Amino acid sequence: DDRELAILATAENLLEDRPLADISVDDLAKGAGISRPTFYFYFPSKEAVLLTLLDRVVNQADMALQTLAENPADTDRENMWRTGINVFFETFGSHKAVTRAGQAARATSVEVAELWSTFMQKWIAYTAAVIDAERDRGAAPRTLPAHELATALNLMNERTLFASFAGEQPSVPEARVLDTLVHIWVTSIYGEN
Amino acid sequence: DDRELAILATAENLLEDRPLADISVDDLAKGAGISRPTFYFYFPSKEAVLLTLLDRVVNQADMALQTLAENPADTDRENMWRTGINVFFETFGSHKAVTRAGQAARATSVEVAELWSTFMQKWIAYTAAVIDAERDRGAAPRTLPAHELATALNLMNERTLFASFAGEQPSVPEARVLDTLVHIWVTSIYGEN
Numbered sequence A, B: 001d002d003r004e005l006a007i008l009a010t011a012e013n014l015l016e017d018r019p020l021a022d023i024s025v026d027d028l029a030k031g032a033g034i035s036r037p038t039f040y041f042y043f044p045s046k047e048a049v050l051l052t053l054l055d056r057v058v059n060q061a062d063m064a065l066q067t068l069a070e071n072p073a074d075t076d077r078e079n080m081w082r083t084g085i086n087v088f089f090e091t092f093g094s095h096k097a098v099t100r101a102g103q104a105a106r107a108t109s110v111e112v113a114e115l116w117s118t119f120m121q122k123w124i125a126y127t128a129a130v131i132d133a134e135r136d137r138g139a140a141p142r143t144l145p146a147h148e149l150a151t152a153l154n155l156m157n158e159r160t161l162f163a164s165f166a167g168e169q170p171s172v173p174e175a176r177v178l179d180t181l182v183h184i185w186v187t188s189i190y191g192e193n
Ligand SMILES: Cc1cc(=O)nc(CCn2cc(-c3ccc4c(c3)OCCO4)nn2)[nH]1
Pocket: A065, A068, A069, A070, A071, A072, A073, A074, A080, A081, A082, A083, A084, A085, A123, A126, A127, A130, A133, A134
């Protein structure tokens, strides 16, 4: 545990300053206070270290959403969506360097792409289930297929949060992105036609 | 012109089968019926060939949007947005291999990233201008800042169209993506609160 956790913490700290390609196994070993061959005991590559960091951040979001999902529904519909979107905002926003490196790795790592895809499918399925339950309650109109609406809104959040965190041009400023996403989710879920 | 256009057509044809990394200068030269050194006359790298292909596709979309933007406004608001989103759907959807390769290159090419960023900023600015004009006409409510709403909706379209064209998991099916995006644009622009 001890040495594994030091490698992960070292990697998260160095990713704040430079991309994974500019971080060496020696940097990771040195920061974790172990030798290079001892590193190779705990991980095969710096790529494996990033996969584990991303797995931890994604599971932290998923666990926080599970906590919310299994509590009573907020009776204010806008606040119910805002609290859930905020789990992603705070969780990924608290790990920007891992977020940035992980989104980059989706192009070069089938494991990173698979991890991201699995969790997106879960979050989309859960979004769709809540939309469906809102329609059954008569709170939301029967407009688009709930699963297709959930997919586009989750993909919006993926792209828009990422752009905000990375300060891309174009991007919504980070202090405006939650309100912007909640508006679009609430109008598109509750909006007639 | 002749030999430049053959190189571009060869490159677009080969990108339908394999990524740029798996295409050689010899493949491009051979398909364009020229020698390797003659290729280097027209382009420094296969990376430069992709930049030119992406520039052509992006300018084709931009010219088609300009054509629409300077014609009279469709008096049906849903149809006005649908026709504009459809320019991106048809244009990028007609050049999926260049779209896929270009989005991949944004990570490795500052020129590709700059080209994509410039055009996204233009399209977001134009979206925001139309929202603002709808609010001035009393057709749309004064909700979110128009430029922030435009940014999230354009980023949604970037991510969602890309995912559909690439058949990513998750994705909206290509036959459903236009209706899905138009619903979200129209409810979020015209929707009160
Ligand atoms: C089964 C059930 C029905 C119901 O109507 N309310 C709940 C609990 C309320 N709730 C909502 C969420 C939630 C809200 C927004 C989200 C989200 C989760 O994940 C993806 C991003 O958007 N988590 N818990 N549970």
